[PDB]
Amino acid sequence: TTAPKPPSAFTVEAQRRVEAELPFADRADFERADRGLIRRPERLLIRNPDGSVAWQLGGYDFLLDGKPRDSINPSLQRQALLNLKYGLFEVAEGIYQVRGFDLANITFIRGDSGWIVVDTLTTPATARAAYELVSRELGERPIRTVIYSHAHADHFGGVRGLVEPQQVASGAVQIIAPAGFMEAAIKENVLAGNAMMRRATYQYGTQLPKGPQGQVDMAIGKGLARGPLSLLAPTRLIEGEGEDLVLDGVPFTFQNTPGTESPAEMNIWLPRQKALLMAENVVGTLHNLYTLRGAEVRDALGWSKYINQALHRFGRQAEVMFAVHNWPRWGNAEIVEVLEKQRDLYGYLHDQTLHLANQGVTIGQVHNRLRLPPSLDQEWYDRGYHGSVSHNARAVLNRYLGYYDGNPATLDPLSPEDSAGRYVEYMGGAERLLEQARASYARGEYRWVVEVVNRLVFAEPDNRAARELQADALEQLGYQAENAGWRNSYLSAAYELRHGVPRDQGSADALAAMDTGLLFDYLGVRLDAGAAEGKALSINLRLPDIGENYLLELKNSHLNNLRGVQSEDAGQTVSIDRADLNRLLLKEVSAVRLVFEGKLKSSGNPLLLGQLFGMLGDFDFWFDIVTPAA
Amino acid sequence: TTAPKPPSAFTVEAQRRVEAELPFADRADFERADRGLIRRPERLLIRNPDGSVAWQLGGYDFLLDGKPRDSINPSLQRQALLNLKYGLFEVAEGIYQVRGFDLANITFIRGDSGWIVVDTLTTPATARAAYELVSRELGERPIRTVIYSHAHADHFGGVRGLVEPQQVASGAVQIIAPAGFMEAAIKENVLAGNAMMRRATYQYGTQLPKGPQGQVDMAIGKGLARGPLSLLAPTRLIEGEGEDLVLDGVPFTFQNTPGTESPAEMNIWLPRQKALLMAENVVGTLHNLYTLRGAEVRDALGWSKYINQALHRFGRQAEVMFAVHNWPRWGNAEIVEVLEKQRDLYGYLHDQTLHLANQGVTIGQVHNRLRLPPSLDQEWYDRGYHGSVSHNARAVLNRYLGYYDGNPATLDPLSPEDSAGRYVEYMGGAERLLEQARASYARGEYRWVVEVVNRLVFAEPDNRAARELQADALEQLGYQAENAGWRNSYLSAAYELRHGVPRDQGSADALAAMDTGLLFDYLGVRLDAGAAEGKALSINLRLPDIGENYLLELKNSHLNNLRGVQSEDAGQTVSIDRADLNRLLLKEVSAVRLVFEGKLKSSGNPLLLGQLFGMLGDFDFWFDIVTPAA
Ligand SMILES: CCCCCCCCCCCCO
Ligand SMILES: CCCCCCCCCCCCO
Ligand SMILES: [Zn+2]
Ligand SMILES: [Zn+2]
Ligand SMILES: [Zn+2]
Ligand SMILES: [Zn+2]
């Protein structure tokens, strides 16, 4: 069968254990999530200009009765329902948020003559919808300032839904961001982007239905709205430790926390309302030190210290703490306790992972040994809905010691598809393997089953009996999973094992923000080494609009670029505005028209740039993950 | 049997293949390594003040005839012999090096009135021995300036063998380093230090004899001298991009390359001799993007660009290039070609790893797919003696995508000791497993054997037949290994499987260089969470000599420290000079004597600091690696 199966007796037992172990009697979040509600629109259906749907919430109606479903981890089901508390809310005097219009929240702070807005959602249509709700309930005001709390797309993505370049150019609107914003907004998504985006189909469960045996939540929100990605450059940067500014009569203290949840990030303290906006440093979950879709590892230590710094500066005196995801927390004692526990959560993960590592516990063991102490374990905002204790501990370890467990048995490993046939042969052939795996499956040993049956799938990818058993076991693990990313991954893997990978199949703002060096670095990543072999060429590239020059050198099957250097011996010198190069790579203009408009100029050998571009390859999106390359 | 076995017919075949595939007819390095030889002392035996031996070379006599030994990869054997070309050499007019007195080289540059010395070896006795050889052959001169090329112990470790603090304090001697030196010298060795040092016993093969079936070389040198680690703070830092200075009449151009082989590193150009000293950016091997002992991953991209920057600034005009490890290369065309190929080597590894990753190739596959192009493959200085193509490719991948392969079968893995019993049961029990593994072994399938028999060892660690077969297969892989670290790891693992882990079992300068925040971070890593559970305490710590204050807070089984903060509600306030705290942790003084000298003062509850220290645990050095914890 290729449809989801019911939860097994073991999965059911696992859900009852969760209820036994976690403080469900602490229901305070349900009152917190509804506090200050001004309007929850009856439905939410947000549409893009091209007619697609940006966002949605009706697919989540199954969650509304609050009835526990054994195909959902009851802790995750609690979070899933809390994330359904959407609409326009009051946080404090003159501070509002729109939650559940997208993955993130959008915040509106009343200035004397209009709004200061913190963050802008993922896509213009969701930001625009949030702004329309605000205007309907609170009266229309102009937006005078937009603040990006940090350099992630679920925060800057929707800016064009709120403001247009002409307003930024007139000085009608300011855009404020932490120093480092523009680099950080783009960099981490580029060089390994195709890998990350494909792997993210698992994390986000993009092929799963919304429902009890599909996608149910995404921890820091319901999921991510779909539509155009926009981005407008900051007009003012908050530098150094932070800054105190007054915006439209309202005092703001900005505290930079670079290198925590994002390389460019800042907390916001509002002294008049005693309101502490913790950016994405403190949300209603354990966050990722390592995003499963693939990314650099984050620094739990700095993360912990910056929360401590915010505690000692503001926690002190805060009457409400709130954030760019999830709901606020009111009352000084509560705020102090949340700050301490989150400081100690990232600190414990860091320190105790290292403590174990220093005792010989490896990257292949640490998640099965490290456990939070009761005081940290027993808070809802410490649960692993988004990050997990397990995958965070391995990330800390990977950060300090790397991927290699120190045992040379594992130093030069055969690819899984190359050892798989022998594992199957040693276990008696596929039928014998299946027979023993089915018995293990019947004992509820799903974490073992998915490991060993994965061998048979990699050896025999067209063995439907193996794919089906492996899917079944993954699905049970997904049902059991507290972490929304783990759930979506397990169910996505089960889906592809059962059905196969899909065979049927801008952003201009994002490209414009990309540094030219990084762009060239990306082109080097696209280079087909087979095509490049034995070639050598060099091109002086001049970009007059941005006043940069690059020297491009292809040699030894590698593309180099160097800023600020030109070579008297380059084979060709090309001049093109960066704006026009961008139009080229986005196919908004032809090379030929550009030459004819005198917008692309060349001296030397006219053919080299075309030769170089002719060597650049492309990446297919839907690569195989749960089987070897087909 | 528990003694090394001869190379198998397959290993022998593997060595003949190496000879077929690599340009052994290119013997130019042998003339390069002997060029400018002034004196090769007949023996080298260097002793420490405590009577130990620092260094070694007589144990390498087996290599001297140049006869190929089938238990050594012939490429590694070539390198091993080249690294035996030790003594005092002329590089250019007034530029000398002592090579083979330690892992690194020490360089002596003739000033008008004494020496400028670049780097200082690992330990004072080896630096002192190098200096004595210099004085014997070239005449005694004072050392007026010491330059640290970068922040690694094999470069700063021996400084006290050359100069003493009193000379630095009088201004008789200057010590020059790249900005960032003092942080970088210490930081990366602290938090996970016990893990790294134990794992390094494998990489360095510290338990192996010197000989054809033991340790033969360490790629960038013969091995590391053993003795006290010294460190003296720089008196002048090279900031920004670099600087041009004149030292004792000699012009120097310093080019910083932060974040390449070390976070603080600089190339040196000497315009009068047209001599280019490439720090540890370019040595006679592919270097590590990831050191197997365990470390953060390095940035191949920046590494590649900085070599390109040095090429375009100096390569241009260089008549000799030399380095802090291995031998020089003379002649402009040769220098230009080495710089290009090394730039493209790190660039190819970076770009092509990402190219593959973007196609779906995972961290578990990439090393079995990525291969250098011929132009890079066919140079001796590109061979993987120190770094490897294989482990570097996985590191690039780990850096961008992390440890997780995207396949949820592997998302929540059982520890090896917990799945091992089932692997053994599925394969028919230990005897059946051994039977099939011995047949695979007889086919020379050593990379498979070590994977599968490792399962049986982890299930049954006292199964001597399994340990013995696993050792045999690892040993063959070690014989075959071109990489000196891989060889030493494989033979070390074989040694422990056969014999067991050893059951019989300062640096004051290094501690003094450690930032106080990092020291406190380390103490938090030592915290026993079991002992800390349920406790809360806070201590204001004041360190008057360095004019720093810290707030220490223990809560939620985590130790926090915050620089520059004090709390009016701390339970205790302690004042102690940092110098004295250091003496305490190095047991050079008692807490009690310090109090009695008025060097440790307290107000508030006098017991808290002792309570905190009482919760701090210790790490055993000899943890198990090739078996589960005993
Ligand atoms: C194409 C795969 C669709 C999944 C969306 C993944 C993009 C994540 C960016 C938003 C989160 C920012 O931290
Ligand atoms: C205690 C284990 C002995 C092995 C020595 C490992 C220390 C490496 C430091 C020297 C290399 C600097 O990059
Ligand atoms: Zn974010
Ligand atoms: Zn976010
Ligand atoms: Zn080094
Ligand atoms: Zn070195």
Curated annotation (Swiss-Prot), chains A, B:
It is an enzyme of class 3 (hydrolase). Keywords: Hydrolase, Metal-binding, Periplasm, Signal, Virulence, Zinc. Its EC number is 3.1.6.21. It catalyses: a primary linear alkyl sulfate ester + H2O = a primary alcohol + sulfate + H(+). Its cofactor is Zn(2+). Its main location: periplasm. Zn(2+) 1 binds at residues 150, 152, 261, 280. Sulfate binds at residues 288-293, 298, 386. GO terms for biological process: dodecyl sulfate metabolic process. CDD domains: arylsulfatase_Sdsa1-like_MBL-fold (cd07710). Contains three distinct domains: an N-terminal catalytic domain that contains a binuclear Zn(2+) cluster, a central dimerization domain that ensures resistance to high concentrations of SDS and a C-terminal domain that provides a hydrophobic groove, presumably to recruit long aliphatic substrates. Although separated by the dimerization domain in terms of sequence, the N-terminal and C-terminal domains are spatially directly adjacent. Alkylsulfatase that cleaves both short and medium-length alkylsulfates, including the widely used detergent sodium dodecyl sulfate (SDS). Acts in vitro on primary alkylsulfates such as decyl sulfate, octyl sulfate and hexyl sulfate, but not on sulfated sugars and arylsulfates. The hydrolysis of SDS allows the bacterium to use SDS as a sole carbon or sulfur source. In addition, contributes to the in vivo virulence of P.aeruginosa by playing a central role in the degradation of mucin, a glycoprotein that is the primary component of the mucus overlaying the host epithelial tissues. Homodimer. This is Linear primary-alkylsulfatase. The lineage of its organism: Bacteria, Pseudomonadati, Pseudomonadota, Gammaproteobacteria, Pseudomonadales.
